[PDB]
From a paper:
The histone variant CENP-A is the epigenetic determinant for the centromere, where it is interspersed with canonical H3 to form a specialized chromatin structure that nucleates the kinetochore. As one of two pillars for kinetochore assembly at the centromere, CENP-N recognizes the CENP-A nucleosome through its amino-terminal region, while forming a heterodimer with CENP-L through its carboxy-terminal region to recruit other CCAN proteins. Here we demonstrate that the human CENP-A-interacting protein CENP-N promotes the stacking of CENP-A-containing mononucleosomes and nucleosomal arrays through a previously undefined interaction between the α6 helix of CENP-N with the DNA of a neighboring nucleosome. Overall, our data suggest that CENP-N, as one of the key proteins of the inner kinetochore, stabilizes, organizes, and compacts centromeric chromatin in a way that depends on its specific interaction with CENP-A nucleosomes and on its DNA-directed interactions with a neighboring nucleosome.
In the cryo-EM images, we consistently observed that ~30% of CENP-A nucleosomes form ordered stacks on the grid in the presence of CENP-N, ranging from 2–10 nucleosomes. Our structures reveal a previously unidentified interface between CENP-N and nucleosomal DNA, consisting of a series of positively charged amino acids (K102, K105, K109, K110, R114, and K117) that are all located on the same face of the α6 helix of CENP-N, on the opposite side of the main CENP-A decoding interface on CENP-N. These side chains allow α6 to dock onto super helical location (SHL) 4–5 of the second nucleosome in the stack. Neither of these side chains is in the interface involved in specific recognition of CENP-A, and as expected, a gel shift assay showed no difference in binding to CENP-A mono-nucleosomes made with CENP-N containing the K102A mutation.
Numbering used by the authors:
A (entry chain D), B (entry chain H): 33 to 124
C (entry chain G): 15 to 114
D (entry chain C): 14 to 112
E (entry chain F): 24 to 101
F (entry chain B): 23 to 101
G (entry chain E): 45 to 135
H (entry chain A): 46 to 134
Amino acid sequence: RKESYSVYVYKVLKQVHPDTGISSKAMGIMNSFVNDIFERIAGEASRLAHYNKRSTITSREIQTAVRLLLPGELAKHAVSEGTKAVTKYTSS
Amino acid sequence: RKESYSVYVYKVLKQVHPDTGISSKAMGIMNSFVNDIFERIAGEASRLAHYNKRSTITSREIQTAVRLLLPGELAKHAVSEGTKAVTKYTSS
Amino acid sequence: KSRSSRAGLQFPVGRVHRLLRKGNYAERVGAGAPVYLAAVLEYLTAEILELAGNAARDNKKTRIIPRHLQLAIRNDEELNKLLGRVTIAQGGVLPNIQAV
Amino acid sequence: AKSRSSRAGLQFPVGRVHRLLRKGNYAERVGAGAPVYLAAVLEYLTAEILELAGNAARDNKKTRIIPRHLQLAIRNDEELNKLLGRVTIAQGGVLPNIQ
Amino acid sequence: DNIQGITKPAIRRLARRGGVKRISGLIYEETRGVLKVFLENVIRDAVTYTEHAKRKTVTAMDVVYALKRQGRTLYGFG
Amino acid sequence: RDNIQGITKPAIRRLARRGGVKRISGLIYEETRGVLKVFLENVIRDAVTYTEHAKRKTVTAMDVVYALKRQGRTLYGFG
Amino acid sequence: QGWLKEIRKLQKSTHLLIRKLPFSRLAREICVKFTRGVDFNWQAQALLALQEAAEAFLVHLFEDAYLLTLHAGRVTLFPKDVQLARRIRGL
Amino acid sequence: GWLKEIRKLQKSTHLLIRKLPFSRLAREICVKFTRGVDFNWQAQALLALQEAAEAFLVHLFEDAYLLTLHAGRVTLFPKDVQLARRIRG
DNA sequence: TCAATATCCACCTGCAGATACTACCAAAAGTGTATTTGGAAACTGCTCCATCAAAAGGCATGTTCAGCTGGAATCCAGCTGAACATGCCTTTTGATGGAGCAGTTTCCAAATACACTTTTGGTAGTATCTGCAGGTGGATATTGA
DNA sequence: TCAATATCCACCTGCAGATACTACCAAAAGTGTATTTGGAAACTGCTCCATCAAAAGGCATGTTCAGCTGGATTCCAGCTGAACATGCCTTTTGATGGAGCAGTTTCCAAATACACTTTTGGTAGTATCTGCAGGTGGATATTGA
């Protein structure tokens, strides 16, 4: 009945730091982190489509929201990653 | 093609200060004022229904949002006015 | 037979309904929400306009301008709290000097 | 048969993100590529923070991450602190700072 | 009482964690007042969120939503 | 000329006086210019994003208002 | 000395500094003044959340305010410093 | 006297920075984000930006002169502008 | 206190830029009537966790003293504001573009529904292992000498 | 500089709580397939309102001075911290019931669709009329004495 992001956080952790664990209090913080950024990005993407009279949210709205929210080099790398993901999703 | 709240602001003004006019720059400020409060109240009402797993926005959500946003005595009077409006709307 | 008249209001109940429906706030909207919200908006509008007209009268004028709105807002304890992260075009500042 | 996270090359879920976007009253329609982009972004940010936190844990000679380490990571970084400046980490403490 | 259970040593510890070397004797009342002000604002918003739902128990999510309103997002409980 | 030396001493003195300031040090005129540049960079960066999204080459007032509203600053008199 | 050891020790830690029962008692007393005179129940995680938030608020305020003692050439914390910090923050 | 100028400038509402310098600066900043393209600017957009900037600066000066007096001074220093920004966030 | 000079208020006249008032219109939108549907309220029951008690001892409280610091009074030199003469940059105006905004078409990508795998969350139960506390044991600065 | 005392720092031991792992399962959630539909891209085109130059006069620039303020020094009394001896209030633990949460009915309220009437936004062409600028007359505070 309850759902979370813990599985995927654990995978990513074993992918960057294979020797390192994580406590239960900390994964709550990480789950809260993921829920917050989702809400922010989707909220900005909702408005851009309303401002421009669009009824559909696409990857362009998410990209623009990423540019607006995230600071500096972090936005640059996030844009690169998302673009690659879409690129190799389409080519399958 | 463009729409605004100027008609109703002018009515309210002639209802509180019959001798007094209003300039065009100021009514822009008032129109901006009305659009801002609408967005805030409706945004809070959207979340309360999501937090509690409801698909409908009612007068109770608006009332709670009014209590949360507005400070002190101002919320009290706003609640009174809205309750009276609904009461005499239903009785017709 | 208009909804604003049935409720005793000057503000538009139908327009508020349409704007709630089109704004992606929820999948459904009830019938008392637009009237309740329109009434709240009318109350706040009139509450500001009263003080602005009073400030105009104090300055010996018959027409409201943004300076008067600013004075009204910043001299009222609650409206300032509501509108404390807001700047009003062509409003200026409140006079304030202080001794050391 | 095949998932969409795998086509995209991701660990995060692309179906769940789609579901949450549709159920959140964000817009009438939702495209095919939006969930992919968003999941990728979330994965990137998670990995960044976890890397920094694991480094902080190792410096303190520990094998397990706790909120102290995430706080140190976040406040020692000039960008994550700007993204998370209005945020308080439970059981995280403060940075040592005298004077 | 009930505000005098926030003791002199507790306030002194909170100050030291903030890097304070010396502390006037009038800081203990001022801190108590500002704390009492902070709790009032959060608690009423929590109680409002709690009453909209028709229950008589304050949950952690009500507190979290209140703080999020005040602009004080909290990680750890939801 | 550097396009920020067009923000002159008298203008800064006037803003300070409207703020109630009696005396001003000579090192305030360069500090203020940096503050202003930072503010403008932050607002304009977001304004340009909103209008490039819409596929325009013209910055409108709504783009500026949206940017400010993001930054935590809400401006009424425009539309 | 003694102040420096204590500062170093306390910045290195994470635990809560106010005792729990007093904070609980105060929060309940404040709640009862709303609610129209009825006593609500509280989950425990709720009180912990509130306590964490409060102590964070106070520590950060003390930090912001000891910057104004040194501005004024002092070492001792006074109440005017806290007042002015709250004013400038916008609270 | 400083006292007459303060009183006069607090009754007024007009903008204090001249238009063309502000426009030039704002267009100089824009071209760095547009990758060489000279974007156009509505006339009602530059006025918005100017109103906002002047408000920001006036309120900052107020907050800082609050800190000059705390220190026992009458003269405004950069020392005092920097600290107000830190405390505001 | 004297007093002229700005300066302060007040009143007046003139005018012109902006607000109210009509017409009109016609496009958009809101209202009224039936019909169908499903979301949420009302009722019942269950079990989880939050209130409420009673012992133990560890942190808080009170008194006193020594020394550190805040605050007031001098004094000196740096530096900001005020005034005047001058000239360069901003403001205003008129003339073209070029880009925004409205219109039409069509096609591609989204919703919709149904059938089929799969993955994730929860529950016993296992065990194991990381780190915290304790204590030994080596070795450094420190404020009183 | 000396150094015992804290104090720091490291190192080793034991164990208890919390982590990680395996198995079951089942359900609910995601995937694949086919159909239909509607939003948005692509291309035209037209009128608005943005940009580019020019002419001049008003605000800014530069120099000097003198009066005010910032900053360092000295002195003294108030007030904070540290130490020590009590004891009172917090913490931990355990039986108990009240309230949250899930499941079932149903019924009242919202969405959908069509017709019809009302309202609001924009333009043309007015006509005021309110507020600002300049002009003049009367009256006081502060500059210096």
